[PDB]
Design a protein around this ligand. Sequence first.
Ligand SMILES: CC(C)=CCC/C(C)=C\CNCCN[C@H]1[C@@H]2C[C@H]3C[C@@H](C2)C[C@@H]1C3
Ligand SMILES: [Mg+2]
Length: 281
Amino acid sequence: MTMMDMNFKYCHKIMKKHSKSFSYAFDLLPEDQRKAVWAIYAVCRKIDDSIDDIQFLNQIKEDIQSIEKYPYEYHHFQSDRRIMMALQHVAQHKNIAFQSFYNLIDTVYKDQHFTMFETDAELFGYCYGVAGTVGEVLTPILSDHETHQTYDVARRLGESLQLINILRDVGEDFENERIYFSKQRLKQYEVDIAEVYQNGVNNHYIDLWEYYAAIAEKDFRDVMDQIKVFSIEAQPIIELAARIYIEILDEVRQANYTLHERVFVEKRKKAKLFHEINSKY
Ligand SMILES: CC(C)=CCC/C(C)=C\CNCCN[C@H]1[C@@H]2C[C@H]3C[C@@H](C2)C[C@@H]1C3
Ligand SMILES: [Mg+2]
């Protein structure tokens, strides 16, 4: 094991720790591609966590800026050195959309003084900053020749996964004093998340939840229809990652939309999905 390997293996640990699903899918990529993904994932995970004040965040940001400006110089990274070395090594061979990390970093900064979304258009803006940006950074890894269509599809996939994540985590987020459903849509469907956390699901809530789930499902179908924008090796894997995340919607439904635990797709169910897709390819 060279030193860079240990850097990547650390990246890998972070990704697996955070997301059993994406790990399960993206570890199936060829070596070169999966290691790039681990590294991009780890950076983004670290940015997601950096607050816990903004000092570590500013350090990650400066690290990323050094890499962009001086891809081939040795840096003394201020933040997490194993992660940034791996990102640097990625950027020496692929085209990183640096503005997409900055967009993510700005969104994390802002989430500091979070106030509920007035409308869905703000909510979908947040899904872009926290996740669409991530799909954009991955685009060169996952496709042979990047065009605007490839970015578009990857950005939609990211935003959709983010919205599914929001749908899974309503109760956990409410505990951490966050609600991501828009005020407009909460008022329209007659829902009060505090009330629902207290007394359980009713029909208004289910209707509201299902309004957003149908958006997530439509976007997912639109992505699957355009899956050819990606490299042949990544196609089945992106289809796996998406199907696994999507299934989360059916898990929520089966737990009657509970606000009191995180539902999950069993590892054994992941393997079933892989089989179904492996055999279409
Ligand atoms: C797999 C494609 C195309 C995009 C990624 C999908 C996606 C960013 C999130 C969905 N699951 C929650 C992850 N939210 C993201 C933010 C917080 C963690 C660190 C960064 C920023 C990456 C993700 C985890
Ligand atoms: Mg966040």
